[PDB]
Amino acid sequence: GFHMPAEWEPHSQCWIGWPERADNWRDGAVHAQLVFTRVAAAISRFEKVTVCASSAQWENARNQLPDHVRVVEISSNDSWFRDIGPTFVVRREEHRIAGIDWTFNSWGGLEDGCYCDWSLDSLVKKKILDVERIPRFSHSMVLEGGSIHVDGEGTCITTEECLLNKNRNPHLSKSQIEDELKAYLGVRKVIWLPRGLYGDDDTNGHVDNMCCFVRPGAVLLSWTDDKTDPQYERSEEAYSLFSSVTDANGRKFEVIKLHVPGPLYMTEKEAAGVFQDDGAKPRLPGTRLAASYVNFYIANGAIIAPQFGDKKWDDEAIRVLSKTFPHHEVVGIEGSREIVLSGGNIHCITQQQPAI
Amino acid sequence: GFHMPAEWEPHSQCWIGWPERADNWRDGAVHAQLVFTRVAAAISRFEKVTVCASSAQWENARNQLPDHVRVVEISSNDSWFRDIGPTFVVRREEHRIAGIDWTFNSWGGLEDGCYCDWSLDSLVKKKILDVERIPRFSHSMVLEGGSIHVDGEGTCITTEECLLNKNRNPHLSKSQIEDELKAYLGVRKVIWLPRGLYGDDDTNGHVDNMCCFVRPGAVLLSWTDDKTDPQYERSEEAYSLFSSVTDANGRKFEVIKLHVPGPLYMTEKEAAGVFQDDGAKPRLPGTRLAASYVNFYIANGAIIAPQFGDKKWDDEAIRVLSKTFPHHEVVGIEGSREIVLSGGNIHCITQQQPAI
Ligand SMILES: NCCCCCC(N)=O
Ligand code: NA
Ligand code: NA
């Protein structure tokens, strides 16, 4: 009787890593640390937070973060807890909470991943559940928490582009992958968007950059009105798909558009501050960033939302999110661009722990 | 209104470190790891245990330890949590528990300490209390938990050999030192044994290796019958002091003698197992081991006692302890010699967290 609750359901805390690697984070992560800190501090106005930092970084993190934020020493290859963190499941009313330890392979493994070493990334789920004394359900299937979303009422959305990629689970068919999601997330229906966001070659189109539930029966969808942008056809396809399906309880989808910023491109400055290495992916100037306002975190009573420094769409997204979540305080995080330069945003760096 | 409760009072958990440094533990610590495992398994029969291992050892510790033992990642320079973990204090009838973060300096600093780098060790207290979300009282005075003992009724016992060494707090008088113990452990009287155990030049004579309370107004004392042994005059002297002095409530001290084993000396095999490095104290053959059954741990209704493989005195200690602690299950830990080779025993590697 375990299932994954919706993100907007109450949490007891939020887990976040701490960026440090010089080959992914410009200027040895100094810029990224400031934003991580702003995100943690914002979330901690609404729910407890634990940031996890390496040995070498523990003091830095402790120094930057207010005291009501807990800092623990957990090493990682990189700081993306949405994907390397456990996925918590609950059984409400004698263990009422547990965590799923999905196999992690750096978003594509030796042939098509981001780093050739992920052995510390792989232990993060175990380590966290050990700190909390929460039971771990281990799974040999490759999965990242960024690649699924739920409504806590039986429905899951995901993308084919990610989950059906041969760099993940080449041994499993689509319908075998679906059976695992249903068994382990406690859902009875999976909606497969064909594609994620244009330009998300890091993760191969994680759904959490393209689409998310905001309540039972309604989703936000990354969108552009520019039919010359390669995003348009993906967004249109997903929109049609949502018109044709219903959720696990038979609701018609209310689709709410959320216009992407930019498009945004890495500068020569931004590329130049990243140390170059032959065990990481070479970040080049002119690369299109995979930027969507959809990559936000729902905290108890607040939406923690990206701002990329594109004023028109930064302001429009705050407006859409304020009306979409009328009972939440919406807090935009200036400097989110510093996270998208390295492959993700606010939702990618968080992992909620549901209250029981 | 905080005070240090006595060791025999109820605990919520025990903290232990994980040995790894090969310049102190023979054969890269493989012998000691087996013993710490045994010690933690034994304690875990009576109270929740958390072992703390570095990143490089986390999997190894998690493998060796039973599932009901929590394993977290807290790196340290060495694994002596009596001295480098926090000293918990409580306030009975709003925060009811806190920890004291004494300054640590590797048992005598750059000049006379055990290793030249202790900066990981210095953070262990912060980190443990951060994990537990327990307030921390910072203290600038150098002190080790091993150098003090309390009855939980206003009395403290320690040694001048340790606390009045110029390698600890050279700018404080005896009186100033005594003031800080009173304010911070909530004791009204401090008994100063002049000396600890012979050959304990690591710690400069921790009381936890010489003498401990059994109950208010009663103590076990490290003892030999051999008056040709250097230990005799130290023991004799301490015995004398207990005849003369009273506790904080003006009770007289029942003393119970506990015969030391050996003398024990480090084999050639033992010394050669240890890697030779300049930043740690060079372990030489023929060196007298600072062994004493007094270095035991009181868990919730158990006594976790050393056994050094010197059967005469091994059996005698269990006897004396089962007698002295008739409401407690005594538990001997074969292989305790592996710990003493690196300069402490069971008491030295534990740190109780009082239940509130
Ligand atoms: N370089 C890997 C970036 C991870 C982004 C995760 C996500 N939730 O889309
Ligand atoms: Na990839
Ligand atoms: Na010393």
Residue numbers in the entry:
A (entry chain A), B (entry chain B): 12 to 104, 112 to 374
Give the text the authors published on this PDB structure.
Herein, we describe the structural characterization of AIH from Medicago truncatula (MtAIH), the model legume plant. The enzyme is responsible for the second step of the AGM pathway of PUT biosynthesis, that is the hydrolytic conversion of AGM to N-carbamoylputrescine (NCP) with the release of ammonia. The monomer of MtAIH is no different in this matter, i.e., five motif repeats (I–V) are arranged around fivefold pseudosymmetry axis that is aligned with the catalytic tunnel in the core of the protein.
Therefore, the conformation of the complex is similar to the conformation of the enzyme with the bound product after the reaction, representing a highly probable NCP binding mode. It is worth to note that the MtAIH-AHX structure shows a somewhat dynamic character where relative conformation of the ligand and surrounding residues (especially close to the terminal amine of AHX) is slightly different in each chain. This can be explained by the nonphysiological character of AHX in comparison to AGM or even NCP; binding of the ligand was enabled due to its high concentration. Therefore, this disorder-to-order transition secures the appropriate conformation of the bound substrate before reaction and the opening of the lid loop helps with product release after catalysis.
